[PDB]
Amino acid sequence: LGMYGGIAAASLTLGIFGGQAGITTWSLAMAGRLNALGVVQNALVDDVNKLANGFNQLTASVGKLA
Amino acid sequence: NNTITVKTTPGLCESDELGSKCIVAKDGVLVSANLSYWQWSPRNLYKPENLTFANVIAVSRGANYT
Amino acid sequence: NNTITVKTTPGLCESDELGSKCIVAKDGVLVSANLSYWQWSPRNLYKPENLTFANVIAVSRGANYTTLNRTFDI
Numbered sequence: 001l002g003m004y005g006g007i008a009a010a011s012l013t014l015g016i017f018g019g020q021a022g023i024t025t026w027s028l029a030m031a032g033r034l035n036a037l038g039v040v041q042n043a044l045v046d047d048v049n050k051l052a053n054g055f056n057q058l059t060a061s062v063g064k065l066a
Numbered sequence: 067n068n069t070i071t072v073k074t075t076p077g078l079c080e081s082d083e084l085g086s087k088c089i090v091a092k093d094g095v096l097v098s099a100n101l102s103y104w105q106w107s108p109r110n111l112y113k114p115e116n117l118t119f120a121n122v123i124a125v126s127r128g129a130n131y132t
Numbered sequence: 133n134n135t136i137t138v139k140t141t142p143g144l145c146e147s148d149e150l151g152s153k154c155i156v157a158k159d160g161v162l163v164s165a166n167l168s169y170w171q172w173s174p175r176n177l178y179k180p181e182n183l184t185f186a187n188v189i190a191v192s193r194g195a196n197y198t199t200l201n202r203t204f205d206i
């Protein structure tokens with residue numbers, strides 16, 4: 001099985017978008033998460049892009065694990 | 067990654083008399099980087115900005131305010 | 133069991149100018165079921181009622197509050 005497909009699929013959104021849906025994008029979900037962690041009061045587009053680059057570099061480094 | 071050491075305080079009051087106008091930080095912390103004035107930062111990151119309406123909360127005098 | 137999809141907002145302010153009178157919901161959420169006005173509900177159940185004194189809290193303007201241009205009557 002794949003984790004996020006199939007008959008018994010897991011939710012990709014449930015722990016950062018929550019159980020009451022309506023947040024439209026991942027940038028708006030991550031800005032609210034940075035606000036609740038107390039590191040930015042109101043996240044701008046450079047604050048969220050800096051988090052998106054650091055996510056994508058780490059996720060691409062999984063393919064080089066020895 | 068990198069830290070800075072600032073001054074901090076639970077709240078700020080105008081005068082020594084009981085019944086003075088006092089403020090505490092709204093969703094953040096009162097910080098001062100060895101300055102002559104006080105600023106606002108998020109609680110988990112040093113990102114200072116000057117004190118404003120809709121940045122503080124008017125309260126009564128608590129214990130050990132500056 | 134059954135859900136409903138409403139509009140919601142962190143707070144309500146009268147005007148666009150900084151220094152306006154603003155309110156947030158007291159122990160609940162500001163909801164609107166595609167109406168022309170705003171109501172109060174518990175945070176985990178839709179049970180709407182009109183906005184009242186002792187139902188809201190007067191605050192200062194936060195980020196992204198909804199502007200009424202109306203001067204709400206409580």
Ligand SMILES: *[C@@H]1O[C@H](CO)[C@@H](O[C@@H]2O[C@H](CO)[C@@H](O[C@@H]3O[C@H](CO)[C@@H](O)[C@H](O)[C@@H]3O)[C@H](O)[C@H]2NC(C)=O)[C@H](O)[C@H]1NC(C)=O
Pocket residue numbers: 102103116
């Ligand atoms: C954040 O707040 C601080 C504290 O007020 C600001 O620094 C202060 O800015 C004022 C006004 O620019 C300075 O006061 C006076 O400036 C006049 C200009 O006409 C001058 O004639 C006087 O000699 C006097 O300097 C003040 O020196 C300055 N520093 C301090 C320690 O009070 C700061 O600019 C603010 N930052 C912002 C709004 O980004």
Ligand SMILES: *[C@@H]1O[C@H](CO)[C@@H](O[C@@H]2O[C@H](CO)[C@@H](O[C@@H]3O[C@H](CO)[C@@H](O)[C@H](O)[C@@H]3O)[C@H](O)[C@H]2NC(C)=O)[C@H](O)[C@H]1NC(C)=O
Pocket residue numbers: 168169182
């Ligand atoms: C909760 O609040 C809403 C919003 O105010 C209430 O609905 C509104 O009620 C007023 C007053 O009944 C209506 O305004 C005017 O009514 C007069 C009656 O003399 C009439 O002459 C006017 O033509 C006008 O309709 C208003 O239409 C109505 N709806 C809206 C969208 O504003 C509602 O009644 C409240 N619910 C409660 C207190 O349970």
Ligand SMILES: *[C@@H]1O[C@H](CO)[C@@H](O[C@@H]2O[C@H](CO)[C@@H](O)[C@H](O)[C@H]2NC(C)=O)[C@H](O)[C@H]1NC(C)=O
Pocket residue numbers: 056057060
């Ligand atoms: C993240 O995804 C984006 C998809 O838009 C990737 O960007 C493209 O990647 C391909 C593959 O090398 C390039 O050929 C394109 O030129 C890229 N386009 C843009 C607009 O960037 C991006 O490489 C991905 N990042 C990581 C770290 O995997």
Ligand SMILES: *[C@@H]1O[C@H](CO)[C@@H](O[C@@H]2O[C@H](CO)[C@@H](O)[C@H](O)[C@H]2NC(C)=O)[C@H](O)[C@H]1NC(C)=O
Pocket residue numbers: 070071072099100
């Ligand atoms: C603001 O003041 C404090 C205290 O004077 C400074 O912290 C000191 O820093 C030196 C060198 O880093 C240490 O040897 C001292 O032990 C520190 N003192 C304390 C009480 O921890 C701080 O560096 C000052 N400067 C700023 C914030 O720019």
Ligand SMILES: *[C@@H]1O[C@H](CO)[C@@H](O[C@@H]2O[C@H](CO)[C@@H](O)[C@H](O)[C@H]2NC(C)=O)[C@H](O)[C@H]1NC(C)=O
Pocket residue numbers: 136137138165166
């Ligand atoms: C209030 O407005 C919203 C948006 O117009 C309605 O939600 C839509 O409902 C339809 C049918 O259920 C869906 O196909 C749309 O995708 C929904 N839109 C969104 C953005 O989710 C809602 O049903 C409206 N009516 C009420 C609350 O009575």
Ligand SMILES: *[C@@H]1O[C@H](CO)[C@@H](O)[C@H](O)[C@H]1NC(C)=O
Pocket residue numbers: 067068
């Ligand atoms: C973390 O701090 C070090 C300084 O020791 C710096 O060289 C490095 O660039 C910092 N990390 C990032 C992502 O900037």
Ligand SMILES: *[C@@H]1O[C@H](CO)[C@@H](O)[C@H](O)[C@H]1NC(C)=O
Pocket residue numbers: 129130
């Ligand atoms: C805090 O206030 C008390 C008096 O209520 C005082 O004795 C104490 O020294 C104060 N703390 C500091 C660090 O000055």
Ligand SMILES: *[C@@H]1O[C@H](CO)[C@@H](O)[C@H](O)[C@H]1NC(C)=O
Pocket residue numbers: 133134
């Ligand atoms: C739960 O919702 C269903 C509608 O699918 C309804 O038939 C049922 O009666 C509801 N449960 C209760 C306890 O009313």
Ligand SMILES: *[C@@H]1O[C@H](CO)[C@@H](O)[C@H](O)[C@H]1NC(C)=O
Pocket residue numbers: 195196
């Ligand atoms: C929230 O406010 C900012 C300005 O502070 C604005 O750029 C942004 O578009 C607003 N959000 C929405 C969903 O309109």
